T-cell receptor, first 197, second 246 residues
Framework: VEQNSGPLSVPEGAIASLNCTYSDRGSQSFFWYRQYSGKSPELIMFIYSNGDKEDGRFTAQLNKASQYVSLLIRDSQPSDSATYLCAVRDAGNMLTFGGGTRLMVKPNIQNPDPAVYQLRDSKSSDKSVCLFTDFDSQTNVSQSKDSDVYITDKCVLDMRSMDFKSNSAVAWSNKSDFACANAFNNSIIPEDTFFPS | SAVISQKPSRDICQRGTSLTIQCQVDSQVTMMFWYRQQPGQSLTLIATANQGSEATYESGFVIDKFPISRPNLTFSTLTVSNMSPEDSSIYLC??????????????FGDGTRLSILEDLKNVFPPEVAVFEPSEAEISHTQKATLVCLATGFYPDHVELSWWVNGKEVHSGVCTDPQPLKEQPALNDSRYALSSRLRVSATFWQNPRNHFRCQVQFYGLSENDEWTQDRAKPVTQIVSAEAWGRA
């Protein structure tokens, strides 16, 4: 039995701490995996004896007396957001995987400019699209209370050439009374959220 | 350092049929395993493939349901027998243990995304639409955000990408990690998916720039029978595009 935890949020630039514990004290090998939402698990590094092991911004800590393995991610970036799995090999060749710990490295929004814009309608679509963008990483986007209104969770895009990151959530619906002024009414948006006419 | 090749990549199969997926390694590795994992869930081991004998199945998985055959060290096949929609998952192949380069850790293959439907008539390709940036965002932030919606597709076998002036771009692009159900209570609900491309207002306001939202859909194959007035939902690319404007 190998035990991970669940969902974790770490500020951009801080150290992300991921730990797992195992039951078999006769374990000989310990591994960390990184897995994105679509891809398959990818081995990031491994450790066999007690101490720390650095491999760039990754650090693997092992204490076999206390029965824990750790993965430290220094100078964490939003691209580190994935599910991190801890695997432990017993006295034989059998690997016991953990449930995995989902990591979310939220970006630092230096100049938060929360606003809800209405994008230009598409002549090929019957939907009106609203964009809640440029809010800071502490704002949570709640699900849709209306049935035929669809709201996605917040997304982090990185304009690399401008060194600019921003959050954004999309809301759309084909109702005739759908307006962006109340598209995110079921969420706790900032009070200074800009609502252009 | 072993290269694991899984086939097929993905497949849409009827309920009650059987699919034989395979896993081949370029080098001889001792241990070999078969995993099952749904997107977002945890990795659950099915069995450990033994060479020239029955595989050792974990609790819950039986041989009559998941026959596993490993002739040599570099080849193994898993058959999902009498498939039901509950067997829909991503089937992983993992190899590890002693090799010519020594005892290497377990690395995984690319997996086989298996979708099992009650009726293949429910396979629909996505409808893709691009929404041009808001003028209020352009004047307020000097940044223009395009939004792409892929809606009404089933199952969730889509791959969204943005293309600017014929070149696939990754900067300023964020797509939803997983599609959302259009009617979550319904078990046959079709999926929707959003994605944003954000550029500088001056780049969007250049009418020479071309913006295309490409959505690769993986559907039925040639051998899959199809008798409907609707166009056969084969593997296809559905796109929506927009030029710049000032």
């Amino acid at each position: 039995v190998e035990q991970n935890s669940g969902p974790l949020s770490v500020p951009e630039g801080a150290i992300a701490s991921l730990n797992c514990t195992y039951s078999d004290r006769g374990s000989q090998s310990f591994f960390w995996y990184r897995q994105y939402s679509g891809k398959s698990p990818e081995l990031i590094m491994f450790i066999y004896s007690n101490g720390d092991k650095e491999d760039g911004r990754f650090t693997a800590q092992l204490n076999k007396a206390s029965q824990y393995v750790s993965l430290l991610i220094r100078d964490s970036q939003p691209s580190d957001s994935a599910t991190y799995l801890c695997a432990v090999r017993d006295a034989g060749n059998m690997l016991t995987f953990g449930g995995g710990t989902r990591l979310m490295v939220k970006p630092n929004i230096q100049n938060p400019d929360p606003a809800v814009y209405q994008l230009r309608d598409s002549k090929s679509s019957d939907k009106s699209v609203c964009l809640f963008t440029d809010f800071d990483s502490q704002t949570n986007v709640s699900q849709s209370k209306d049935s035929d209104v669809y709201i996605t969770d917040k997304c982090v895009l990185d304009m690399r050439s401008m060194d600019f990151k921003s959050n954004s959530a999309v809301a759309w619906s084909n109702k005739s009374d759908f307006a962006c002024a109340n598209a995110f009414n079921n969420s706790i948006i900032p009070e200074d959220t800009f609502f252009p006419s | 350092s072993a290269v694991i090749s899984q086939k097929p990549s993905r497949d849409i199969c009827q309920r009650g049929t059987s699919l034989t997926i395979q896993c081949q390694v370029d080098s001889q590795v001792t241990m070999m395993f078969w995993y099952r994992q749904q997107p977002g869930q945890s990795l659950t081991l099915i069995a450990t493939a033994n060479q020239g004998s029955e595989a050792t199945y974990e609790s819950g998985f039986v041989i009559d349901k998941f026959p596993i055959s490993r002739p040599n060290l570099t080849f193994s096949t898993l058959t999902v027998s009498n498939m039901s929609p509950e067997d829909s998952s991503i089937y992983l192949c993992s190899v590890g243990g002693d090799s010519l380069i020594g005892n290497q850790p377990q690395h995984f293959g690319d997996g086989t995304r298996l979708s099992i439907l009650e009726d293949l008539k429910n396979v629909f390709p996505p409808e893709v639409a691009v929404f041009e940036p808001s003028e209020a965002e352009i004047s307020h932030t000097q940044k223009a955000t395009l939004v792409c919606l892929a809606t009404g597709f089933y199952p969730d076998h889509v791959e969204l990408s943005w293309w600017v002036n014929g070149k696939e771009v990754h900067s300023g692009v964020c797509t939803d990690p997983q599609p959302l159900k259009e009617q979550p209570a319904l078990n046959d609900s079709r999926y929707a998916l959003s994605s944003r491309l954000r550029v500088s207002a001056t780049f969007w306001q250049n009418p020479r720039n071309h913006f295309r939202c490409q959505v690769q859909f993986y559907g039925l194959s040639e051998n899959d029978e199809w008798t409907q007035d609707r166009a056969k939902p084969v593997t296809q690319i559905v796109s929506a595009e927009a030029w710049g404007r000032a």
